[PDB]
């Protein structure tokens, strides 16, 4: 058994998230065997286009995380300028070159903060 290096980081994040649940989203593994493939459930914010909505996105971490950012893709249909027709999310926190670029220090919380903000202002 060879453990991917970022496993400890990802496990800590998952646990930190589970012990500090947040309003408006839940994050977990699609498959407990696999720390690199997450799903995030996101509640559409009040007084927006998305109010009443609930959305599933996949957050997929590269095997060399945290040096490279995860990729995010909405699975539930959604309309947003930063979300392409495949569902892929185009957001600067997830672009390689503080929250306007990927830095190895960004956590899932940092990413979701940015995603929630972009929905609260389409």
CA-based angle 64:65:70, to the nearest 5?
A: 120
Confirm whether 90 is a catalytic residue. yes
Per the residue annotation, which of 8, 54, 67, 90 is the catalytic one? Answer: 90
19 preceded by a cis bond (ω within 30 of 0):
no
Q: Which of 58, 42, 56 is nearest to 115 (CA)?
A: 42
Q: Which two tokens stand for residue 86?
A: 């495949």
Looking at the annotation, which residues are catalytic? 90
């Amino acid at each position: 058994g060879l453990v991917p290096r970022g496993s400890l980081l990802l496990r800590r994040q998952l646990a930190e998230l589970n012990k500090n649940p947040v309003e408006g989203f839940s994050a977990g593994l699609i498959d407990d065997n696999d720390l690199y493939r997450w799903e995030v459930l996101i509640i559409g914010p009040p007084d927006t286009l998305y109010e009443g909505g609930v959305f599933k996105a996949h957050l997929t971490f590269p095997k060399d995380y945290p040096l490279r950012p995860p990729k995010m893709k909405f699975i539930t249909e959604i309309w947003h300028p930063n979300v392409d027709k495949n569902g892929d999310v185009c957001i600067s926190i997830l672009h390689e070159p503080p929250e306007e670029r990927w830095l190895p220090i960004h956590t899932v919380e940092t990413i979701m903060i940015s995603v929630i903000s972009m929905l609260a202002d389409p």
